[PDB]
Design an enzyme around this catalytic site. Structure first.
Site, PDB file in Angstrom:
ATOM      1  CG  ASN A 168      97.597  80.226  28.583  1.00 56.53           C
ATOM      2  OD1 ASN A 168      96.156  80.373  28.934  1.00 56.53           O
ATOM      3  ND2 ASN A 168      98.226  79.337  28.701  1.00 56.53           N
ATOM      4  CE1 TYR A 207      93.982  71.193  29.111  1.00 57.90           C
ATOM      5  CE2 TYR A 207      94.054  70.880  26.537  1.00 57.90           C
ATOM      6  CZ  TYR A 207      93.386  71.801  27.755  1.00 57.90           C
ATOM      7  OH  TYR A 207      92.658  72.948  27.574  1.00 57.90           O
ATOM      8  CD  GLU A 214      91.441  73.688  30.599  1.00 55.85           C
ATOM      9  OE1 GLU A 214      90.961  74.529  31.752  1.00 55.85           O
ATOM     10  OE2 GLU A 214      92.006  74.205  29.935  1.00 55.85           O
ATOM     11  CE1 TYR A 257      94.591  71.957  32.810  1.00 58.78           C
ATOM     12  CE2 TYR A 257      96.476  71.736  31.726  1.00 58.78           C
ATOM     13  CZ  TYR A 257      95.676  72.228  31.970  1.00 58.78           C
ATOM     14  OH  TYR A 257      95.391  73.457  31.615  1.00 58.78           O
ATOM     15  CD  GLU A 270      98.018  75.252  29.890  1.00 61.22           C
ATOM     16  OE1 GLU A 270      97.407  74.311  29.960  1.00 61.22           O
ATOM     17  OE2 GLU A 270      97.586  75.991  30.531  1.00 61.22           O
TER      18      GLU A 270
END
Length: 190
Positions: A44, A77, A86, A88, A177
Site C-alpha cells: 500500500n 485526496y 480522509e 477522496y 494510491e
C-alpha cells in the site's frame, strides 16, 4: 531523483509520499506540479502533489497518464482535522472500485460527470494524528479519466448537504494510491 517516503515542498508544490514498507514502489518528483510513480508488486502506498493546507473551494487541474495493473486509485485526496476525515474525489481506478460494499449517500454532478457519494469508516488505523477511528468520504467519478479539472467545492458542498462534515483542512493532493498492485503514472498538478 527518486525519494523515500516523506513530505515537503518541490518546485513550489506540497508533496506527500507514504508507503507501508513492503517494497516495489518508485516515487519521483518532477518539475513544477509534476510527479511520477512506477510500481511493481507493491504494498500500500499513496503519493502526489498539491497543497498544505487544502482549501474548500479549490479548482484543481491535473493532466497526464495513469496505467494501473491491479488495485489503484487516482484521486484528489486529503484530510481534515476536527473532525478527522480522509477524503477522496476519485477520477480513475484499477481493478477495485473503492466504494464496493459502501452505502451510497447521493450523487453530485461536476466537471463533466456524475459522481456517486459514499461514507466508510476506518477503525483503529493510521492517520495524520496517530492511530484512530475516522470516517472517509468518497465521490467516485462514473466517467474515468486521467486529465481534467476538479471543482472541489461541488464535492465538499454535496458532502455537507448529505451530512458529511469536513473540519479544518490538512493537505490536499492529486494522489496515485496503490494496494498490492503494479503500474505507472505521470501527473502534473496545478
Amino acid at each position: 531523483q527518486t525519494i523515500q517516503p516523506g513530505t515537503g515542498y518541490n518546485n513550489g508544490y506540497f508533496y506527500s509520499y507514504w508507503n507501508d514498507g513492503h517494497g516495489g514502489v518508485t516515487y519521483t518528483n518532477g518539475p513544477g506540479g509534476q510527479f511520477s510513480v512506477n510500481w511493481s508488486n507493491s504494498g500500500n502506498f499513496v503519493g502526489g502533489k498539491g497543497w498544505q493546507p487544502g482549501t474548500k473551494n479549490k479548482v484543481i487541474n491535473f493532466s497526464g497518464s495513469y496505467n494501473p495493473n491491479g488495485n489503484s486509485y487516482l484521486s484528489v485526496y486529503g484530510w481534515s482535522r476536527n473532525p478527522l476525515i480522509e477524503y477522496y474525489i476519485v477520477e480513475n481506478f484499477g481493478t477495485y472500485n473503492p466504494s464496493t460494499g459502501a452505502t451510497k449517500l447521493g450523487e453530485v454532478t461536476s466537471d463533466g460527470s456524475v459522481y456517486d457519494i459514499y461514507r466508510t469508516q476506518r477503525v483503529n488505523q493510521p492517520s495524520i494524528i496517530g492511530t484512530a477511528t475516522f470516517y472517509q468520504y468518497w465521490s467516485v467519478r462514473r466517467n474515468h479519466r486521467s486529465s481534467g479539472s476538479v471543482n472541489t467545492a461541488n464535492h465538499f458542498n454535496a458532502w455537507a448537504q448529505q451530512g458529511l462534515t469536513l473540519g479544518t483542512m490538512d493537505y490536499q493532493i492529486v494522489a496515485v494510491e496503490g494496494y498490492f498492485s503494479s503500474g505507472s503514472a505521470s501527473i502534473t498538478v496545478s
